[PDB]
C-alpha cells in the first residue's frame, strides 16, 4: 500500500503551481494514502491532491488558514506509526506540558515533517525521519536553489520503501531507500 508524502507547496504564492514534470507521476488511483505537511496555502492544491488519492491527511502549518486541519497528526498506516506535524512549531523546551504532548509525536515510527523545504530522509535507531522538502520547490526566507522533492512510500509488512523524487534541472532523479524495521 502506497503513501504520497509530501506539501510545502504554497500555491499560489512561491510557485504558480505543481511542477509539470512532477504532476506527471501523480495519477489517480494510484495512491492509498497522502500525509502532507501542510501550506498548500488554498482550496484549488486540497482538491487536487483529493483527487490522487481518497484518504487525505492534512496538518495546519505556518499561516496556514484552515482550522479543521489538525496541528499534529499521527496516523497508523499497516503497522507504521507515522508523525505528522507541519515542522515549524518549534516547541518552547521549558514549556513542559507542551514537551509531554509531543513525546506522542516522537512516539511513531515514521516521523513526517517540513517547512525546512529542505528535503531529508534517513533512518536512526529503528525509527525513520522524512522532511518530503518542497513539491513545488519554493523559497523560503533563507536561500533560493531549493530542489523540488515530494516523496512516495510503499508499506508493506514491515518493509518501507521510501522514494524521493527531486526535480534537478532536467531531469527527475529517484532516491530510493530501504527503511525496515526489526
Ligand atoms: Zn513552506
Ligand atoms: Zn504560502
Ligand atoms: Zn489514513
Ligand atoms: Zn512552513
Redesign the pocket.
Known amino acids: 500500500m502506497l503513501v504520497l508524502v509530501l506539501g510545502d507547496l504554497?500555491?499560489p504564492?512561491?510557485c504558480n503551481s505543481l511542477p509539470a514534470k512532477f504532476k506527471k507521476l501523480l495519477v489517480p488511483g494510484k495512491i492509498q494514502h497522502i500525509l502532507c505537511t501542510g501550506?498548500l496555502?488554498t482550496k484549488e492544491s486540497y482538491d487536487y491532491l483529493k483527487t490522487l488519492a481518497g484518504d487525505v491527511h492534512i496538518v495546519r502549518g505556518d499561516?496556514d488558514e484552515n482550522l479543521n486541519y489538525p496541528e499534529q497528526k499521527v496516523v497508523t498506516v499497516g503497522q507504521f506509526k507515522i508523525g505528522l506535524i507541519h515542522g515549524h512549531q518549534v516547541i518552547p523546551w521549558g514549556d513542559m506540558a507542551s514537551l509531554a504532548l509531543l513525546q506522542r509525536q516522537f512516539d511513531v515510527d515514521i516521523l513526517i515533517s517540513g517547512h525546512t523545504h529542505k528535503f531529508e530522509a534517513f533512518e536512526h535507531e529503528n525509527k525513520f525521519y522524512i522532511n518530503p522538502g518542497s513539491a513545488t520547490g519554493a523559497y523560503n526566507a533563507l536561500e533560493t536553489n531549493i530542489i523540488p522533492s515530494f516523496v512516495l512510500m510503499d508499506i508493506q509488512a514491515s518493509t518501507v520503501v521510501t522514494y524521493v523524487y527531486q526535480l534537478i534541472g532536467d531531469d527527475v532523479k529517484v532516491e530510493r531507500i530501504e527503511y525496515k524495521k526489526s
Open positions: 504554497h500555491i504564492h512561491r501550506n496555502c499561516f
